[PDB]
Amino acid sequence: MEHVAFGSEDIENTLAKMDDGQLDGLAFGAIQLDGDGNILQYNAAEGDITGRDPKQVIGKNFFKDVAPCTDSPEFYGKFKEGVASGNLNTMFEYTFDYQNTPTKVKVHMKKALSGDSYWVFVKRV
Ligand SMILES: *C(=O)/C=C/c1ccc(O)cc1
């Protein structure tokens, strides 16, 4: 396992340019999105939480295709505001309920260091 805690202040530096295999070593779910919400990376811990197959969701749009329950002001709205402003950093609880048992999580969205890239971190609550 990689020694990184959910919510750590410099998480974007520690994860920066992490390849797919190392991302799978994290204790929490990690997704990397472009500014439109297309999925660039999606780790094993996230797949274990959500049921999605990490290899198949790459390239899909998170808000339009994979996760319509997040297409709302409280999730997508916050994401796109942070993309538009270039500085996103927000943490909030949410319930995932699309075609799977409703599952409450804590979500941390934070702008990455790499261009046109934005992290969505997830753990169970
Ligand atoms: C609601 O539709 C949420 C769906 C979802 C959340 C997070 C994921 O990694 C995959 C699907």
From Swiss-Prot:
Domain of life: Bacteria
Molecular function per GO: identical protein binding; photoreceptor activity
Domain PAS: 23-86
PROSITE patterns: PAS (PS50112)
InterPro entries: PAS, PAS-like_dom_sf, PAS_fold, PYP
PTM comment, free text: The 4-hydroxycinnamic acid (p-coumaric acid) chromophore is covalently bound via a thioester linkage.
Family named by the database record: Belongs to the photoactive yellow protein family.
Role this protein plays: Photoactive blue light protein. Probably functions as a photoreceptor for a negative phototaxis response.
Quaternary assembly: Monomer.
Protein name stated in the entry: Photoactive yellow protein
Natural source organism: Halorhodospira halophila (Ectothiorhodospira halophila)
Gene name tied to this protein: pyp
